[PDB]
Design a binder for this molecule. Structure first.
Ligand SMILES: Nc1nc(N)nc(-c2ccccc2)n1
Ligand SMILES: Nc1nc(N)nc(-c2ccccc2)n1
Ligand SMILES: [Zn+2]
Ligand SMILES: [Zn+2]
Lengths: 158, 158
């Protein structure tokens, strides 16, 4: 299963996804943590002003390219409530970030959308390693499945 | 179906790729065209200052989300010298842009890189529609294969 320390940062990601929903946005949150265990950057979706590319994982990738050396990026971890879409997985790989840990997979998300009769996203729900074959990926976290099911249903399952 | 008009925009993308090469960057160029035929935005790779996500197709997607209505985006066309990487294909789909026309495929680039012993991209060379299933895609343009091979050789040959 997932480490206890990893699960604590995933719970922070879920809290960020809840912040996003409560601000009229989509429930996706992500945290960048360095190899010392220091949180460097936290973000959530910001698509409500009209830019559907406003994903936290992408913001993290550009922040890392700006602020961190290649060595430091490679040793950092990105935690996310939901597995990176292909945009974000590719951006992560381009900048040379390290491990990804997700609470819920894109397989879970896509399966729930179809359960609810909801439209699929306009991007295929490709696993990270289809897009970015070298990235170390862990998840999902069983303890957080129900919570994320309920967040996603609130936004996308009406 | 690559019309004479399409080839003209592709040639402009080649010119933008060469601008990038001559500025110390990588030879990738892209143009956003309104359905009325007006060029809206032009760009090329800007990765030399350390951000490997600085691709023109991505810049086009974010510019389009900032400046164009959804209806205008849907009717716009993106031309590119090189087929979108997954990052850029996904961004295009997220913002709801229209048709993509490319001069050279990402399979062609990948094959040329391998022949040079150049470092493969850390992203898979997925065709656009693997990432963005609903996007209308045309390309490659045989007339521009050699020209692009030569530009790529200038940057990545060894
Ligand atoms: N951050 C984010 N926002 C949305 N709306 N969807 C996604 C997503 C993640 C993986 C696959 C497909 C969509 N990611
Ligand atoms: N714009 C661009 N820049 C680079 N360095 N590589 C690409 C690329 C396109 C398709 C697949 C893989 C890389 N695109
Ligand atoms: Zn994303
Ligand atoms: Zn790209």
């Amino acid at each position: 299963a997932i480490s206890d320390a990893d699960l604590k940062y995933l719970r922070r990601c879920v809290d960020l996804a809840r912040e996003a929903l409560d601000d009229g946005d989509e429930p996706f949150g992500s945290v960048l943590v360095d190899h010392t265990g220091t949180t460097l950057f936290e973000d959530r979706n910001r698509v409500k002003d009209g830019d559907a590319t406003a994903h936290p994982e992408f913001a993290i990738a550009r922040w890392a390219a700006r602020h961190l050396t290649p060595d430091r990026r490679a040793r950092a971890t990105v935690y996310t409530s939901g597995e990176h879409c292909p945009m974000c997985a590719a951006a992560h790989a381009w900048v040379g970030l390290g491990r990804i840990v997700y609470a819920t997979s894109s397989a879970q998300l896509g399966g729930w959308l179809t359960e609810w009769g909801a439209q699929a996203p306009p991007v295929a729900t490709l696993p990270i390693n289809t897009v970015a074959p070298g990235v170390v990926v862990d998840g999902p976290a069983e303890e957080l499945a129900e919570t994320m099911h309920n967040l996603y249903r609130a936004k996308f399952g009406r």
